[PDB]
Structures are given as structure tokens and as C-alpha cells.
Amino acid sequence: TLSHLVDVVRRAHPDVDLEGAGVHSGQFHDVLIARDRVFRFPKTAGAAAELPGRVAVLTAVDAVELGVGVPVPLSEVRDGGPHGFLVLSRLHGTPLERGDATSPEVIDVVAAEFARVLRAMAGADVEKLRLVLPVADAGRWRGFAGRVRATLFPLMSEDGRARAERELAAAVAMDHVATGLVHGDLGGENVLWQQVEELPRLTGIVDWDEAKVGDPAEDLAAVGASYGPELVERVVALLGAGDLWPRIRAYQGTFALQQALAGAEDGDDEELEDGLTAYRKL
Amino acid sequence: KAXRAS
């Protein structure tokens, strides 16, 4: 009952307008959005464990000093509400539209905004991160391949399965890399910009759910998926990461199948359909 | 979700 949660918040934080306040819901978490603050309320007592999990990931990422904002716990985890709640900062800024990011007058600025963040992520103390974050597992793509063949291959054309087998294989073939912080989903929607004296500034990165000690190529793949090779070539040039192109393409070739598999597993029909379109005719 | 990975 969002009524109770509303009272929980007003009681704990009297001065926080919940009229015209966002709400995300799922069988796991309720989230009230406000001007400067996000309130997360777990639904089960097991899902309560997500709260210190989120605090631990965000604190470890903050400690790397990326030079851009990440969500900040604004409160201790509290055992108020049904199964606890956590107050996080709300970051300001908007994703860069593909059109905006690529203009000749801003493309170099955008490339360096991505580069300075990715550079800081690659320079993270991995021994510290490895204690808190998930660590890329050598069996990850093997296992992912298994679940795609079991769950999605039946829904595909023969041409679909051939294409999917090549894309799965390129990922399974990659040698294991765990050398820095990886966001794991660094598409445009999770990267927030403001016009600062009439040029873009990357001010925030949100949604660290897939954060891990892993392969820097995975974040470059995601930037490529959102903004195209013109931008990623400039980021790679700046980083001196020309070595990574095969790995970047291997990650990018799994993105439609990742979305399809999640659509099947999450029971989202539109994600399943959208993910599979290149892998069948009808 | 969504093509980037979600």
C-alpha cells in the first residue's frame, strides 16, 4: 500500500512533496521519486538485502572517484516501512540524443567525457573492488549460450540460429579480462548530461545494477550501441584502446540476444519480440 | 530494458 509508504516517508522526512512524485513498482521493490531524493521500499524480507547491496556497490563506485556523480545514499538503511527503506540522491541531467552527441562542434567533448570516466574506471584498485562487486566469471558466456540455445533457438529461423551461433561463439571465444570497474549497461539512458556554458558535460551515471570487476570493452560496446562507431572510435583513440575492437564487437553482437533472453525470463513480450527480430522472418 | 546489457 503506497498510502502507508507515503506516511512512512512524511513521518521520517516531513518536507518531501509526494504529489506529482514518480512511482516504479515490481513484485520486489516500490520506489518513490521526488525533486532531489529517491525512496526504495523492498516488499519481501529477502529483497530487504538489496538495500545494503546497493549501498555497498554505490560506496565502492564512489570511492573510485570517476569525476562524475553517481547516486549517493542520503540516509543509513532504515528498518522502518514493511522491510526497510533507503534514501538515495536523484542526479540531474538528461541522456544525450544520438543527434546531439555526434555534431562536429561537440563530438570531441563527448568523446573526452566518456574517456575520462572510462579511464578512471580502468584505473580502479581492483583488489578493493573485488571484495564488494561481482567479478566477471570465465563461464559467463558459455552459460549465456546454453540458456539462449535452450530458450530462444526454437523461436528462430534456421538463418536466425546460424547468426546467433556466430554471435554467441564470438563472446565464448573471448579470453577472461577482469582489470577494472565495468558499469555493465553504459547505454545513453544511464548517462546524464547538462549544458555547462553551452557545451555538454557528463554529470551523472545511474543504474549500477550490473556493476562488476570486468572487461573495459563491455562499456565501450554499450557506448557504441547508443552512439555509433564515429563516437566510439574517438573514445578508443583517446584511451589508446585500439587493441579492444574484437572484444567490443563480441559484446555488441550479444546485445539483441541479451534483450531477448531477459524478455523471455522477465516475461516482457515486447523485449522478447524486439530482441528476436533479426533471428526470424515473421 | 534494451540493446546496450539491457
Query: Residue A138: which CATH number?
Result: 3.90.1200.10
Chain B residues contacting A, CB < 8 Å?
1-6
- A185 tagged catalytic: yes
* Adjacency order of strands within the sheet including A37-42: A23-25, A29-33, A37-42, A86-89
Using CB atoms and an 8 Å cut-off, which of residues 178-207 of chain A contact chain B? 184-189
Experimental method: X-ray
Residues of chain B with C-beta less than 8 angstroms from the C-beta of A232: none
Resolution (A): 2.1
Domain with A179, as residue range(s), is 98-276
CB contact under 8 A, B3 and A186: no
